[PDB]
Amino acid sequence: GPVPSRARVYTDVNTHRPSEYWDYESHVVEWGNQDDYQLVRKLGRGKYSEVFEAINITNNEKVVVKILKPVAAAKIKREIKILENLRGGPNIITLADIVKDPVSRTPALVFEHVNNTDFKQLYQTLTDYDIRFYMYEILKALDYCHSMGIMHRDVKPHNVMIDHEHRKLRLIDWGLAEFYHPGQEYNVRVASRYFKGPELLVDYQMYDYSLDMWSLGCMLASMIFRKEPFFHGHDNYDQLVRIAKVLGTEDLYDYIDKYNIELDPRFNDILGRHSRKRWERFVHSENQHLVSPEALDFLDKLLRYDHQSRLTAREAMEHPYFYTVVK
Numbered sequence: 001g002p003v004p005s006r007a008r009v010y011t012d013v014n015t016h017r018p019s020e021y022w023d024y025e026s027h028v029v030e031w032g033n034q035d036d037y038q039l040v041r042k043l044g045r046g047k048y049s050e051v052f053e054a055i056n057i058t059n060n061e062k063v064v065v066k067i068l069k070p071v072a073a074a075k076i077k078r079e080i081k082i083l084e085n086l087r088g089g090p091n092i093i094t095l096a097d098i099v100k101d102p103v104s105r106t107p108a109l110v111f112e113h114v115n116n117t118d119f120k121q122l123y124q125t126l127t128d129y130d131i132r133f134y135m136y137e138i139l140k141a142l143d144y145c146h147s148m149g150i151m152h153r154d155v156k157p158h159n160v161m162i163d164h165e166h167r168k169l170r171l172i173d174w175g176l177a178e179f180y181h182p183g184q185e186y187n188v189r190v191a192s193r194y195f196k197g198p199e200l201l202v203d204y205q206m207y208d209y210s211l212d213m214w215s216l217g218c219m220l221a222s223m224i225f226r227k228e229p230f231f232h233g234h235d236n237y238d239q240l241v242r243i244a245k246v247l248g249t250e251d252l253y254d255y256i257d258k259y260n261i262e263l264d265p266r267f268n269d270i271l272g273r274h275s276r277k278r279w280e281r282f283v284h285s286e287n288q289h290l291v292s293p294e295a296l297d298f299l300d301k302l303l304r305y306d307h308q309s310r311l312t313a314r315e316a317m318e319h320p321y322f323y324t325v326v327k
């Protein structure tokens, strides 16, 4: 059977905090007044919620309302508890209130509003300096939540709001976040396909905070190499093959052998044998302005099969790639 794994950092956080901190099923929700909020426009809808721009009529300030779709009550209580635990943390979205929507008959989470700059505009115009700057801001959010015993598990550009005019970044959508408990087996059906860590793709359930660092590396690779997404799988199986065409199959076998994981035999028809590639192979005249030896070294330390070998968020903050960023 699989060899167990533990995070190399923040293993004891949920042990030394009181049970009320992580026992989200026991949490009693403090309900606000739904009449304080007036929905202005629908911003979007996903499989878990409908999101609206709204106005808080007690102070005329813009807010964002996330009306939850009915799903297992445990998922709703977990997101609320995580948001309350992390409130006030660097670059963590602020949960302002929780109200009962009269129409949906479900909880509606009210958040601070972020004037989110167009994503296409950010992807197309962020400079080398801006990418370093915002990556450092995301690392502040991730080290904070990991230090608080929480893994986000859905790190991707759509979950990072940036108000570029005010150089303000917030990490949002904590609906897939979980408390990290050493030895716990987690559901591998988390994160969006292109951001899924190899641990999810090989069905290794005893993962930890380091899953977020893989997803962060996928974001950085796409951004600096101008290749959206960087690992472009047609499905979850082809997703691992796309990773193996860059990182190589020999290091993939070293990883699964270390943890006594067997690949699904369906990989025999599609995986093949691939050498590890040098990161310089992805550099060309249209992305060279965003690449540096420091960017490649940093990327190499995030995009590693072995989840225990990746840089932690706090180690990543010390990396030479961020020396140019004004602190």
Ligand SMILES: Cc1cc(F)ccc1-c1ccc(C[NH3+])cc1Cl
Pocket (backbone or CB within 6 Å): 049, 050, 067, 068, 069, 070, 101, 103, 104
């Ligand atoms: C979209 C959805 C799906 C459901 F199964 C139940 C409720 C809802 C829902 C209904 C109305 C609104 C607006 N208050 C929002 C939602 Cl999530």
Ligand SMILES: Cc1cc(F)ccc1-c1ccc(C[NH3+])cc1Cl
Pocket (backbone or CB within 6 Å): 118, 119, 122, 123, 126, 130, 131, 134, 135, 138, 156, 157, 158, 159, 160, 161, 162, 219, 220, 221, 223, 224
């Ligand atoms: C600032 C950044 C840096 C990256 F390396 C990769 C992606 C992004 C990014 C691009 C657009 C958005 C807007 N939702 C957010 C982010 Cl984090």
Ligand SMILES: Cc1cc(F)ccc1-c1ccc(C[NH3+])cc1Cl
Pocket (backbone or CB within 6 Å): 280, 283, 288, 289, 290, 291, 292, 293, 296
């Ligand atoms: C030529 C090279 C080789 C590497 F191994 C890593 C980075 C670089 C490099 C150095 C400077 C720049 C300018 N922004 C770009 C690159 Cl790819």
